[PDB]
Design a binder for this molecule. Sequence first.
Ligand SMILES: COc1ccc2[nH]cc(CCN)c2c1
Ligand SMILES: COc1ccc2[nH]cc(CCN)c2c1
Ligand SMILES: [Ca+2]
Length: 223
Amino acid sequence: IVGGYTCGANTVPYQVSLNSGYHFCGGSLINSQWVVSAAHCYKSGIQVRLGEDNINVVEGNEQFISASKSIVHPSYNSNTLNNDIMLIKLKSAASLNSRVASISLPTSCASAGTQCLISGWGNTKSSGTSYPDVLKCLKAPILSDSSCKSAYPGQITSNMFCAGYLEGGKDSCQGDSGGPVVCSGKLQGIVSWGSGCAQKNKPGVYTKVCNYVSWIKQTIASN
Ligand SMILES: COc1ccc2[nH]cc(CCN)c2c1
Ligand SMILES: COc1ccc2[nH]cc(CCN)c2c1
Ligand SMILES: [Ca+2]
């Protein structure tokens, strides 16, 4: 997260870190057994780390649970990033509490102008590299579909939306991939892609979670 703020330990209780020897992506806990992330975060050997603040220090609220199964969306295209969503099932159920909590799925899509919270352990610099230990947060509005498409000609599908600041300076970045965009208490987005980070006229692009709720629910119901 570039241009954000330190969230505060365990204040984003649905935020997970996906770990394969190191943090490599975010995700969102949606029930005691399941995490939603980006399809571009797929790899084998994932350990889901819940209750994290400092990802390099055991602080006492973590739960570390290995994935039993990953399900990339059937229509994910890794060249265009269309349908950039994946589900991860935990080998055992997380113990839910005030610091490890699921985030509600949307019942309808969110509108341009809605304020959201984007979070992760990604790079905090737009030119250069610095990776934080503690979770970073950014409040950002959803942008209009028209401004999103104008910013990224030929690339925005009906399964994507932009959020952030056309002036630059505030954005998600590398390592925030797969993490949450939460608006009015609902998971509306997943950190998906963008041109650089925090660049003028190049806002972050996010998977439009509301399009996937039926797939998520039916997948959970049979897996
Ligand atoms: C865009 O950066 C990342 C970062 C972490 C990642 N893990 C696995 C993948 C590729 C998915 N098959 C990936 C990509
Ligand atoms: C500019 O390099 C990267 C590298 C990896 C990334 N993952 C997601 C994003 C977009 C964040 N808005 C991103 C950007
Ligand atoms: Ca920790």
